[PDB]
Write a protein that holds these residues in place. Structure first.
Motif, PDB file in Angstrom:
ATOM      1  N   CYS A   1       0.806  -1.117   0.017  1.00  0.00           N
ATOM      2  CA  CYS A   1      -0.070  -0.168  -0.054  1.00  0.00           C
ATOM      3  C   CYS A   1       0.943   1.277  -0.022  1.00  0.00           C
ATOM      4  O   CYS A   1       2.056   1.251   0.346  1.00  0.00           O
ATOM      5  CB  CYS A   1      -0.942   0.021   1.118  1.00  0.00           C
ATOM      6  SG  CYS A   1      -0.241  -0.072   2.753  1.00  0.00           S
TER       7      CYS A   1
ATOM      8  N   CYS B   1       1.286   4.030   2.132  1.00  0.00           N
ATOM      9  CA  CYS B   1       2.134   4.448   3.226  1.00  0.00           C
ATOM     10  C   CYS B   1       3.043   3.201   3.866  1.00  0.00           C
ATOM     11  O   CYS B   1       3.641   3.547   5.047  1.00  0.00           O
ATOM     12  CB  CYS B   1       1.268   5.178   4.209  1.00  0.00           C
ATOM     13  SG  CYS B   1      -0.101   4.161   4.929  1.00  0.00           S
ATOM     14  N   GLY B   2       3.097   2.267   3.262  1.00  0.00           N
ATOM     15  CA  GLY B   2       4.055   1.111   3.719  1.00  0.00           C
ATOM     16  C   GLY B   2       3.537   0.203   4.558  1.00  0.00           C
ATOM     17  O   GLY B   2       3.968  -1.031   4.913  1.00  0.00           O
ATOM     18  N   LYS B   3       2.381   0.541   5.324  1.00  0.00           N
ATOM     19  CA  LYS B   3       1.644  -0.053   6.492  1.00  0.00           C
ATOM     20  C   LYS B   3       1.503  -1.610   6.361  1.00  0.00           C
ATOM     21  O   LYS B   3       1.486  -2.465   7.140  1.00  0.00           O
ATOM     22  CB  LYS B   3       0.457   0.542   6.863  1.00  0.00           C
ATOM     23  CG  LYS B   3      -0.425  -0.046   7.874  1.00  0.00           C
ATOM     24  CD  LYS B   3      -1.518   0.760   8.664  1.00  0.00           C
ATOM     25  CE  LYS B   3      -2.115   0.075   9.400  1.00  0.00           C
ATOM     26  NZ  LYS B   3      -3.237   0.767  10.042  1.00  0.00           N
ATOM     27  N   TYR B   4       1.143  -1.869   4.913  1.00  0.00           N
ATOM     28  CA  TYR B   4       0.840  -3.268   4.572  1.00  0.00           C
ATOM     29  C   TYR B   4       1.768  -3.603   3.710  1.00  0.00           C
ATOM     30  O   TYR B   4       2.100  -2.846   2.754  1.00  0.00           O
ATOM     31  CB  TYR B   4      -0.736  -3.232   4.083  1.00  0.00           C
ATOM     32  CG  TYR B   4      -1.777  -3.045   4.823  1.00  0.00           C
ATOM     33  CD1 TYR B   4      -2.730  -3.917   5.557  1.00  0.00           C
ATOM     34  CD2 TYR B   4      -2.044  -1.877   5.215  1.00  0.00           C
ATOM     35  CE1 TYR B   4      -3.549  -3.771   6.231  1.00  0.00           C
ATOM     36  CE2 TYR B   4      -3.120  -1.394   6.372  1.00  0.00           C
ATOM     37  CZ  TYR B   4      -3.802  -2.387   6.899  1.00  0.00           C
ATOM     38  OH  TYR B   4      -4.923  -2.277   7.758  1.00  0.00           O
TER      39      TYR B   4
ATOM     40  N   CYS C   1      -5.636  -1.007   2.606  1.00  0.00           N
ATOM     41  CA  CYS C   1      -5.194   0.249   3.933  1.00  0.00           C
ATOM     42  C   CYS C   1      -6.349   1.194   4.269  1.00  0.00           C
ATOM     43  O   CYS C   1      -7.099   1.721   3.347  1.00  0.00           O
ATOM     44  CB  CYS C   1      -3.954   0.424   3.327  1.00  0.00           C
ATOM     45  SG  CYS C   1      -3.302   2.226   4.360  1.00  0.00           S
TER      46      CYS C   1
HETATM   47 ZN   LIG Z   1      -1.195   2.231   3.481  1.00  0.00          ZN
END
Ligand SMILES: [Zn+2]
Ligand SMILES: [Mg+2]
Lengths: 263, 79, 14, 104, 221, 94, 52, 39, 1111
Positions: D56, D58-61, D71
């Motif tokens: 995703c 922003c890197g979160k997933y 996300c």
């Molecule tokens: Zn994300």
DNA sequence: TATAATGGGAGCTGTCACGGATGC
DNA sequence: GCATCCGTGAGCGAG
């Protein structure tokens, strides 16, 4: 919109054409809530219409410059499908192909009808996947990734590589295409004979059928892959299997010039 | 009714063959309105989609043939 | 055609 | 299945919204400092898909762990980046507009 | 006219400012309407141009910094009889401006070029045709990455299914997640320090399998 | 030319059927790794190397040869595709 | 031309006998290249009629 | 090309079109290639 | 070797300076030498004078000036910047009614400069501007294709200044004038012009049944200022006449010398055509306040007198070289400058209003961007500005004397009928009939004739001799294409005693039509036969024997010859070969009578009469546009005396001042085992050995180190995970040391870019931990040598920031260029030709032992298949062998001009003199006749070749005299059954070499959108399998082999990742999926409002995107 | 944000033949 | 029904 080698950006004409429409839509939206007179709203809705026309089929009303700077029409959705260059003639009815090469053709007096001269270095890259395997069964490499790294630089080429390449090619055939490809016999399947030096050795009698001469004439090579594609090439496509013209019934490979004279 | 090779080439039933020819802006719109289904009877239709062409070693006459040794032949013969 | 020309004349009515 | 037939037909505005993963309400393409797709822009990770596979905005997933997961912070499904060649979007027109092929 | 917006778009954006002026106009002031409309028309056109004239969009303040940079470069050309250095502009652009800043501003101001730019005098060639696809893995790359998962599955057979599973779970070869030792201890039945011990001995048994076999080596890249 | 070719066009109703038979048989010798072959060892296609004679690598070259001898049976709907696949993998495990 | 070139190539032409020639060659060369765009066109039509 | 009966599944149109088309560059008191096209 | 030269024809004038058409034309446009007030108002001076003053405040132009180059020529090449000079222009801003002036000198930017040889520099890359041909401005009458006895009048201006105008008589008899593609009665115009029904019946009325059609409308005879309004509204809808807008649109269409400008040529053409005088290049005049006529009535009088046949009234050719004209480098640039200027003036009038309306310098009132960009346009992105072809000195010359009917301002390819292409009777002396591109361009690009010159009006002129009485004056009259038509002009071949006409009949042409004429009726005479053919065509000896179509390759193929390290000028020459080295600078010369002081490979220093010690450095081993090697070699020695004009140094390919494209090899003409079959060619390895045909070629590679978003890019000796094996030749700074040998795949310059966002695959995190080394921060980006290229590193150029001398692109840290030169021996696949248009690939290099020889052991260098000759009809190559036979033996070279040259009789005699050295040596040496020589003299006489009964000595002579000798076979030792023609021939190694052309691909780069492989050698991509190629597959009925090229082998992605996986493993190939370029088509069509759907046999849908594009 | 300012600006040309539509 | 308008096409390689 991609970054080239130099870091600079290169975008598709469809993007400046979509941003034009988006702008006139989103200004038309703003005008109507702001309650503009009918002479302004007329205008904005007319311009919304030559944005949709520029996008779908451009040049059917007047042609949008990308900027006043280039008088090059923005290339639209219609322009992309139709043409010599269009998506259809360029991409779907013919393609650039993966296993293929090109060289200058040179006269082949010694080779038998069904055979032709292929430079070492071309034959290497054309069969490179087959050769990495054959380098594994014979011992010249631990594996593929090693074998491949061995062929990457040109001082790294071992004698067994060559004597193993001969092991690959056995029985297989390739296709020769001189263009103009006028009629079916303008691509013929020959069995390759690895030669030193940098050019292709064509058999004399088929010269006439391809309309090849050696004035510097160049020819393309392709490699049939599947055990199927091989059968097709070797049975029907072989240079020695098509000896008459499909056009008139008359012999296509005939004694040509030096050969008529000799006799 | 006699017609020339350009008209008859566009007029072909299959519109993938018609539209790869010429007047693509035109071929496609009459085809689209008509909701034309294209049986791929022809070469160009098949060549576009990458399908095996209806001629040669794709011809349904010869396409289907099967080869077997005499060993396996009498071998499955029991059932 | 020529939306500039036509818009101008639409403006010239008022 | 196997493909024996190919049909071409005019698509109602609804058939298009069927195809459409979201509206592009803004012209901007990329951001000037970080070159990343602008929100509701012509290139948007939200609408068309993530730039990089299974990751995703922003890197979160990351990785495979999430196949159909979207996300909450970014708005991007995590799936093979190749969807950017496939997924489509719409622009909803203030006034109905003719398709020049049926006019001309 | 030539600023990146079409005539009709400049007129429409100007008309939108004519409206802003009709709502802001106070007739008690003796000024004719044309005076007040003119300011709002020029303002809405300049906002418009700065907004919409770039494929890669730049903020309005940033736009006129680049513009000021242009005019200053131009003035310096008029003076020097030649194009100025990054540092010659950086001086003329006053305090806070160095060569590095004048440079970076220019790169940030670089507009994208159409992929459809023709190559040669013939109509046959386009620019974007010479542009490779770096994203999608070449057949070589995809072949290699499979031969890696094959070579790792062949060397994880030499381990027992427990100690190979400690490693398969901990580095993310399964499901794509890396589990902490306390978790591989919760799954196996071992204490957290016992799964750190059978992870270390399994990694060590792998190191011997590698120093002995010479397989995974070529993947050094 | 390809050996015995004329007789190979005398074997079939359509020249492109012989090609299918050659292509399918060659894929069978490949899969079973040459062991289902109808050739006796003297009739083996051989390849001339540095070392001496070794078996011809081209499964096609082989298949054409298999054919000229009556050893092989071609036709339409001889056996269901299940039976054929399995009975060959049983007879000749790969 | 009402007057023919008398020389063989073995004799060799004259400066003027030569000039006259290049009329033929030039108009023949442009014919050969113009019907060439037309052959390959006709060709592509025929292929398209008769493919199926 | 084999001087024997045609083998079922031959692509005949593309054969015919080619056979007609290959000489075209050679059609020259003559109406020539365009006479052909006219027809 | 002593040079005996044939032919008695004397050349009254030598050839004009050959680069003159560029050199002179650009100097005239600038006038940088001329003191500013003596500038003559042509060219650059004219644009200023036209665009200024700038009205309303009045900004007025005074004078312009040209400063010195930012950088010297060489520097500009290496540094990728343009060779140019600053242009400042002095203006004075005047105030309307205040009287005040402020006069400042404004800086207008830089303008590109022409080098010594007539070429330009652009960014390090030489360019030539190429002259263009088009219908000359003027007044022309052509027959109406509608009706036989009717004619259309055409009025043509300079192409972008003013519209074309047709004046038709029919249908109904009223004069119809078409402008901006709108037809109206021409009559209505005449009223606006200060014409009334009376003034028209006077001069024009004379022609019956015609004038009646014109005056049909009396209602139009009413008034000038009503008719002006009426017309203005006939031209544009919706635009209110306003009576201001009428005059401004009409004047700006016709009377404004700014908007509408006839050719200065066109001016004269019509003055002579309709027999009137023009005041200016305008059609009409604004003379206060009414519109006064000039052009319109005498074109109307001319049309009307042509319609009903009146004697003296001409239709015009339009292919005539008086009705077509040459626009040169000087005019072509002035144009783009006239357009860049009037935009700048537009920018003036916009800022002459707004701003401080009071505070304006000229400095602040002027912006160069419209002008700067407008010239950079012409030079950089134009069609007539062409990448300079200097393969070799002749290439680069001819390129200048190339002439296009192509280019913006003229024809495209679909547009050119047989007309424009055809050789037209006035191409005599003016354009070449021979040198034209064969194939698609034929008759569009051509070379200018040798003696031909382009005059001030841009018409071509050829020299002729005035002949008065029987005598021929030595005065050369240079004639326009048209003024040649008034006279009878003899050939140069016509016989002369002293200055007198020596024949009872001479051959001459009236208006190009051939006719036989008394010595009394001869007005002029050709200067030389050389005046007819391009420079190139004139390098062909015996050309009077070669057929036209082959000579075209003779010319065109000389442009191609690669400069050889041991190069020779032909043993058979046409005499020009010495001065061609001169005119396009190849050789170096002495400026005044003098004496040589120093001698180097690097420099040569001379002391003159002056006493001044003058240094000439030598350019050594420099790369040219095509990568052929320019080096000047010193040709004089320490202390050698030289008069003005003598040679100090030889050009890249020149032999002691003569032109050396190829070499003189000894060629025997026979079929040889089909190795020379179909224009292929067989070679004595004796050429390779002694380094014939071996030539030097530098290639240039370049590499950039930028500032990434993700870090720097560094050029360093440090490349991750790389053996010393690889870095060995590199220096400490990362650049390959000079003089190192390089191969394919090797590192030219090493570089480290910072890696992208790192998602090492889960297979990587395990492997990383296993081997214990950490993933490096920088990928290996290093530039390498492409496959099939390589050589010695001759130079390295490094540039960092801190550069006092050059411009560095934004964000670009440092740039390195490495120079790799290869000495290519001749090889198989390589290409050779000769001066007669005989051309082939080299098929076989035989050892010297297998090679066919003579009675003495001396072997031939080449074997040429006789079959090549008779279909090709080029017999001059035969005569090149025959004369070249004897010049071998006698140790001499010849000069035999075109059409006046060696006849066989004098050659025969030269063969007789050669024979004696040949045979008489063997006869003295104590050797009689060989037993085979007999068996051949046997069959020779059986062939009627020798007179039976003469001795074998007189039979070997009669055979040798036919240029044939007894040739022994290398392989047997038995002779060649017949005698065979052998002799020296000038043959050149051509541009196209296999080393360059051979390429083969497996897998590799794919275009972004299509996923299909890229094209071309150095982008490394697969061949095109096109529509025509697919038809072949289909016709053969090879189904799979086709599905391969369409699927696995191109864009079917999954298919090809798995196809290659399958072969590697040693598995049979997978079953192809959908070609990715098909899914591109479905989604393009959905983007077109078109739903496209695949289907079941059951009519139910099938998803080929495998669910990704559906919710 | 206030002096007054109110309808563009380009002008590109040696096809050609075709068929099918639109106009007199 | 003929004149006349508009819209359509017009055969590998390197750059
Ligand atoms: Zn994300
Ligand atoms: Mg050829």
């Amino acid at each position: 919109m991609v970054q080239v080698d130099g870091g600079r950006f290169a975008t598709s004409d469809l993007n400046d054409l979509y941003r034009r429409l988006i702008n006139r839509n989103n200004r038309l939206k703003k005008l109507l809530a702001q309650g503009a007179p009918e002479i302004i709203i007329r205008n904005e809705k007319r311009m919304l219409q030559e944005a949709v026309d520029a996008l779908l089929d451009n040049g059917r009303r007047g042609a949008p410059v990308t900027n006043p700077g280039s008088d090059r029409p923005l290339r639209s959705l219609t322009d992309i499908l139709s043409g010599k260059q269009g998506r259809f003639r360029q991409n779907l009815l013919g393609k650039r192909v993966d296993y293929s090469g090109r060289s200058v053709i040179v006269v082949g007096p010694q080779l038998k009808l069904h055979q032709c001269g292929l430079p070492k270095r071309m034959a290497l890259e054309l069969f490179k996947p087959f050769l990495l395997k054959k380098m594994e069964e014979k011992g010249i490499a631990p594996n593929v990734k090693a074998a491949r790294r061995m062929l990457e630089r040109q001082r790294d080429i071992k004698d067994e590589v060559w004597d193993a390449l001969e092991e690959v090619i056995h029985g297989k055939v390739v296709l020769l295409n001189r263009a103009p490809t006028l009629h079916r016999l303008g691509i013929q399947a020959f069995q390759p004979v690895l030669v030193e030096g940098q050019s292709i050795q064509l058999h004399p009698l088929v010269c006439e059928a391809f309309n090849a001469d050696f004035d510097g004439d160049q020819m393309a090579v392709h490699v049939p892959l599947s055990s199927f594609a091989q059968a097709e090439a070797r049975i029907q496509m072989l240079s020695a299997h098509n000896l008459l013209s499909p056009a008139s019934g008359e012999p296509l490979a005939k004694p040509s010039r030096d050969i008529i004279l000799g006799l | 009714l006699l017609m020339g090779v350009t008209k008859s080439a566009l007029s072909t039933k299959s519109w993938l063959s018609a539209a790869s020819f010429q007047n693509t802006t035109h071929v496609l719109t009459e085809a689209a309105i008509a909701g034309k289904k294209d049986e791929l009877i022809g070469l160009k239709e098949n060549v576009i989609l990458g399908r095996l062409i209806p001629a040669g070693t794709g011809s349904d006459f010869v396409r289907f043939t099967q080869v077997v040794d005499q060993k396996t032949l009498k071998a499955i013969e029991e059932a | 055609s020529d939306p500039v020309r036509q818009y101008l004349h639409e403006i010239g009515q008022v | 299945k196997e493909v024996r037939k190919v049909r071409i037909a005019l698509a109602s505005p609804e058939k298009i919204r069927s195809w459409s993963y979201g509206e592009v309400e803004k012209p901007e393409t990329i951001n000037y400092r970080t070159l990343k797709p602008e929100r509701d822009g012509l290139f948007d990770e939200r609408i068309f898909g993530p730039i990089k596979d299974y990751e995703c905005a922003c890197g979160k997933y990351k990785r495979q762990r999430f196949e159909g997961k979207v996300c909450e912070r970014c708005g991007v499904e995590v799936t093979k980046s190749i969807v950017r060649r496939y997924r489509m979007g719409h622009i909803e027109l203030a006034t109905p507009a003719a398709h020049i092929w049926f006019v001309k | 006219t030539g600023r990146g917006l079409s005539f009709l778009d400049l007129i429409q954006e100007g008309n939108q400012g004519l409206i802003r002026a009709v709502e802001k106009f106070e007739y008690k002031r003796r000024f004719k309407f044309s005076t007040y409309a003119t300011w709002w028309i020029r303002q809405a056109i300049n906002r418009a141009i700065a907004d919409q004239a770039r494929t890669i969009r730049i903020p309005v303040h940033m736009v006129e910094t680049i513009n000021k940079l242009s005019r200053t470069a131009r003035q310096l050309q008029q003076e020097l009889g030649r194009e100025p250095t990054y540092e010659e502009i950086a001086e003329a652009m006053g305090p806070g401006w160095d060569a590095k800043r004048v440079e970076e501003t220019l790169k940030i101001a670089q507009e994208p070029v159409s992929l459809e730019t023709p190559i040669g005098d013939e109509k046959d060639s386009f620019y974007g045709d010479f542009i490779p696809d770096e994203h999608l893995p070449s057949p070589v790359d995809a072949a290699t990455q499979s031969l890696l998962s094959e070579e790792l599955e062949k060397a994880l057979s030499k381990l027992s299914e427990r100690e190979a599973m400690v490693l398969k779970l901990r580095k993310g070869l399964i499901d794509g997640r890396e589990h902490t030792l306390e978790e591989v201890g919760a799954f196996f039945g071992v204490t957290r320090e016992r799964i750190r011990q059978i992870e270390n001995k399994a990694l060590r048994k792998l190191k011997y399998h590698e120093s002995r076999t010479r397989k995974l080596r070529d993947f050094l890249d | 030319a390809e050996p015995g070719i004329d007789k190979l066009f005398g074997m079939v109703d359509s020249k492109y059927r012989l090609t299918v038979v050659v292509a399918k048989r060659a894929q069978q010798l490949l899969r079973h790794g040459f062991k289902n072959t109808v050739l006796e060892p003297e009739e083996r296609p051989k390849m001339q190397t540095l070392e001496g004679l070794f078996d011809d690598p081209n499964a096609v070259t082989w298949a054409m040869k298999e054919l000229l001898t009556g050893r092989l049976v071609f036709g339409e709907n001889l056996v269901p595709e299940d039976r054929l696949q399995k009975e060959m993998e049983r007879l000749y495990p790969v | 031309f009402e007057v023919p070139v008398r020389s063989s190539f073995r004799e060799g032409l004259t400066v003027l006998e030569y000039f006259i020639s290049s009329h033929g060659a030039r108009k023949g060369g442009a014919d050969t290249a113009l019907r060439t765009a037309d052959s390959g066109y006709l060709t592509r039509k025929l292929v398209d009629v008769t493919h199926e | 090309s084999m001087a024997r009966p045609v083998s079922i599944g031959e692509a005949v149109g593309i054969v015919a079109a080619q056979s007609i088309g290959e000489p075209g560059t050679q059609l020259t008191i003559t109406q020539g290639l365009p006479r052909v096209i006219e027809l | 070797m002593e040079i005996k030269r044939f032919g008695r024809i004397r050349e009254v004038i030598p050839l004009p300076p050959l680069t003159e058409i560029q050199v002179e034309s650009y100097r005239r446009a600038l006038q940088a030498d001329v003191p500013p007030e003596k500038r003559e108002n042509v060219g650059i001076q004219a644009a200023f004078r036209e665009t200024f003053p700038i009205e309303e405040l009045v900004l007025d132009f005074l004078e312009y000036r040209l400063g010195e180059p930012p950088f010297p020529q060489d520097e500009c090449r290496e540094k990728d910047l343009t060779y140019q000079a600053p242009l400042y222009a002095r203006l004075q801003l005047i105030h309307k009614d205040t009287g005040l002036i402020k006069e400042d000198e404004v800086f207008l930017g830089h303008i590109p400069l022409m080098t010594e040889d007539g070429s330009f520099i652009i960014n390090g890359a030489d360019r030539v501007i190429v002259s263009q041909i088009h219908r000359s401005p003027g007044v022309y009458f052509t027959p109406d294709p509608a009706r036989p006895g009717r004619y259309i009048a055409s009025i043509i201006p300079l192409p972008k200044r003013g519209p074309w105008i047709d004046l038709e008589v029919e249908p109904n008899g009223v004069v119809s004038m078409k402008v901006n593609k709108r037809k109206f009665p021409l009559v209505l115009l005449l009223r606006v012009l200060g014409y009334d029904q009376e003034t028209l019946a006077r001069e024009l009325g004379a022609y019956g049944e015609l004038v009646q059609g014109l005056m049909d409308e009396s209602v139009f005879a009413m008034r000038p200022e009503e008719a002006l309004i009426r017309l203005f509204t006939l031209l544009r809808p919706g635009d209110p006449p306003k009576r201001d807008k009428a005059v401004a649109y009409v004047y700006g269409l016709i009377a404004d010398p700014r908007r509408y400008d006839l050719g200065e040529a066109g001016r004269y053409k019509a003055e002579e055509k309709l027999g009137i005088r023009l005041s200016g290049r305008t059609l009409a005049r604004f003379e206060d306040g009414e519109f006064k006529d000039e052009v319109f009535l005498p074109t109307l009088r001319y049309l009307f007198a042509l319609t009903a046949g009146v004697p003296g009234h001409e239709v015009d050719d339009i292919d005539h070289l008086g009705n077509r004209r040459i626009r040169t480098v000087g005019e072509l640039m002035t144009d783009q400058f006239r357009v860049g200027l009037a935009r700048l003036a537009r920018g003036v009038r916009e800022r002459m209003l707004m701003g401080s309306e009071d505070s304006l310098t000229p400095a602040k009132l002027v912006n160069s961007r419209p002008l700067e960009a407008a010239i950079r346009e012409f030079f950089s992105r134009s069609q007539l500005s062409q990448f300079k072809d200097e393969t070799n000195p002749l290439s680069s010359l001819r390129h200048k004397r190339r002439i296009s009917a192509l280019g913006p301002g003229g024809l495209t390819r679909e547009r050119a009928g047989f007309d424009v292409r055809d050789v037209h009777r006035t191409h005599y002396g003016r354009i070449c009939p021979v040198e034209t591109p064969e194939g698609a361009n034929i008759g569009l690009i051509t070379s200018l004739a040798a003696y031909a010159r382009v005059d001030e009006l841009g018409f071509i002129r050829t020299p002729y001799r005035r002949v008065v009485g029987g005598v021929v004056t030595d005065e050369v009259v240079y004639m326009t294409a048209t003024e040649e038509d008034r006279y009878t002009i003899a050939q140069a071949n016509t016989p002369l005693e002293g200055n007198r006409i020596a024949a009872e009949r001479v051959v001459a042409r009236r208006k190009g039509e051939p006719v036989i004429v008394s010595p009394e009726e001869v007005e002029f005479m050709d200067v030389s036969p050389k005046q007819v053919f391009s420079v190139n065509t004139n390098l062909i000896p015996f050309l009077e024997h070669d057929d036209a179509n082959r000579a075209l390759m003779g010319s065109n193929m000389q442009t191609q010859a690669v400069p050889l390290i041991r190069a020779q000028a032909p043993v058979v020459m046409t005499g020009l070969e010495e001065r061609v080295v001169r005119d396009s600078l190849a050789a170096l010369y002495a400026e005044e009578d003098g004496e040589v002081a120093k001698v180097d490979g690097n420099r040569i220093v001379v002391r003159y009469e002056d006493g001044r010690l003058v240094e000439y450095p030598l350019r050594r081993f420099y790369r040219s546009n095509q990568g052929t090697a320019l080096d000047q070699r010193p040709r004089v020695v320490v202390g050698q005396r030289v008069r003005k004009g003598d040679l100090l140094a030889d050009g890249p390919a020149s032999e002691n001042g003569f032109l050396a494209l190829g070499q003189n090899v000894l060629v025997a003409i026979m079929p040889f085992d089909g190795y020379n079959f179909e224009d292929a060619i067989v070679i004595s390895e004796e050429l390779l050995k002694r380094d014939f045909y071996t030539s030097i070629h530098i290639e240039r590679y370049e590499i950039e180190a930028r500032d990434t978003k993700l870090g720097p890019e560094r050029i360093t000796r440090d490349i991750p995970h790389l053996s010393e094996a690889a870095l060995r030749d590199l220096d400490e700074e990362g650049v390959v040391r000079i003089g190192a040998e390089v191969k394919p795949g090797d590192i030219l310059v090493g570089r480290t870019s910072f890696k992208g966002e790192s998602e090492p695959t889960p297979e990587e995190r395990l492997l990383r931990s296993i081997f214990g080394e950490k993933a490096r921060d920088v990928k290996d980006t290093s530039l390498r040598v492409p496959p099939g290229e390589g050589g010695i590193v001759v130079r390295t150029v490094r540039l960092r920031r801190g550069d006092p001398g050059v411009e560095l692109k934004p964000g670009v840290r440092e740039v390195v260029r490495v120079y790799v030169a290869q000495k290519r021996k001749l090889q198989v696949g390589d290409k050779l030709a000769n001066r007669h248009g005989n051309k082939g690939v080299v098929a076989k290099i035989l050892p010297v032992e297998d090679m066919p020889h003579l009675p003495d052991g001396t072997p031939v260098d080449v074997i040429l298949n006789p079959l090549g000759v008779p279909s090709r009809m080029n017999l001059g190559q035969i005569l090149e062998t025959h004369l070249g036979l004897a010049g071998y033996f006698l140790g001499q070279r010849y000069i035999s001009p075109i059409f006046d040259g060696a006849k066989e009789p004098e050659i025969k005699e030269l063969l007789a003199q050669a024979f004696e050295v040949y045979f008489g040596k063997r006869k003295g040496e104590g050797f009689g006749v060989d037993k085979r020589e007999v068996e051949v003299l046997r069959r020779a006489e059986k062939l009627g070749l020798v007179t039976p009964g003469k001795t074998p000595e007189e039979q070997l002579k009669e055979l040798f005299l036919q240029g044939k000798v007894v040739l022994y076979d290398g392989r047997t030792g038995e002779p060649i059954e017949g005698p065979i023609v052998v002799g020296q021939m000038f043959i050149m190694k051509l541009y196209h070499m296999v080393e360059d052309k051979m390429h083969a691909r497996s897998t590799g780069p794919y275009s972004l959108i299509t996923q299909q492989p890229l094209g071309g050698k150095a982008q490394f991509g697969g061949q095109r399998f096109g529509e025509m190629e697919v038809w072949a597959l289909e016709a053969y009925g090879a189904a799979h082999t086709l599905q391969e090229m369409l699927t696995l082998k191109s864009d079917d992605i999954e298919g090809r990742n798995a196809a290659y996986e399958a072969i590697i493993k040693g598995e049979d190939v997978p079953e192809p999926s959908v070609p990715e370029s098909f899914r591109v088509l479905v989604k393009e069509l959905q983007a077109l409002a078109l739903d496209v759907q695949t289907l079941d046999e059951k009519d139910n849908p099938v998803d080929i995107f495998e669910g990704l594009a559906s919710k």
